[PDB]
Amino acid sequence: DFEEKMILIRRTARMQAGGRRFRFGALVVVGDRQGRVGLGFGKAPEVPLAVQKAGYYARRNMVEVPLQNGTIPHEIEVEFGASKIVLKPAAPGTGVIAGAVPRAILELAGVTDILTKELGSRNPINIAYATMEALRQLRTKADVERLRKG
Template sequence: MGKQPGGSGGGGFGGREGRGGDRRDKTKGRRRKEERQSEYKETVVKINRCASVQKGGRRFSFAALAVVGDERGRVGVGYGKANEVPPAVNKALKEARDSMVKISILGDTIPHEIVGEFSASKVVLKPAAPGTGVIAGQSVRAVLDACGVRNILSKAYGNTNPINLVKATMTALRALRTKEEVAALRGVQIP
């Protein structure tokens, strides 16, 4: 009887010789790179497949919507397109990292109620008491989690397309102001 594939010893599928042992060494560099970038929370909200009809049949391309945040008040949104899914996701994540903005948050909620609109989508965000959690749909939740908000109430009206909802949420979050920021803008001191 010969050696079993995958057993200890010689060749086969799971042996230590040949390709199996080399593969682990090659990924060490990639793992270190991923650990460096893991300071941000990265979420892929939506992957959309688009088809263009050619003479020989359909040609597919992919679009990815991603949200990146540091969970301490900075968040960004990106949209990437490519002929395969991984490059589309990478483009979206890169754009999201490059477009990060600082959001005014108060503890683990937002300072005041706000409405964000984009296209036909409307998102209402309300501050919530500790222990409430994030009450939001998938798209809005991705942005709020990446931003570091832990207690919030939200409601989406109109078009519920994920891209529009994410952009409406970002519009609302960018418009948030704390008491101190408003006082500084008005040139007034808080009593």
């Protein structure tokens, strides 16, 4: 049980002798707002159902977003697919400036001070997957020199 807010929903379609069957897609983000979030994509014969599955998957796949003042440890860039995403931390008291997808995700992740920017393909779905793998790649001075032991 977390925040749970859905990014986008879409109706797709497939062809078959006699007309077009359909299906609906739901992208959903999930967070407690402490540094826990998860992305979930769910497709099914109907709107209600799809959204449900979304949430279920969302929880299945969550990431430890390590804040450092309600912002972020370091600046990162990540390409997933044809879609590039830039993450730059802001000084406390700024706001979370981003487009639907990146914002969405980042709110529940409990950020409050972040500069973004979608580049390349601005496909929601892939910007999603993009942002995750960015957060998923966040390091603090700790876990850093934690690897520079020896």
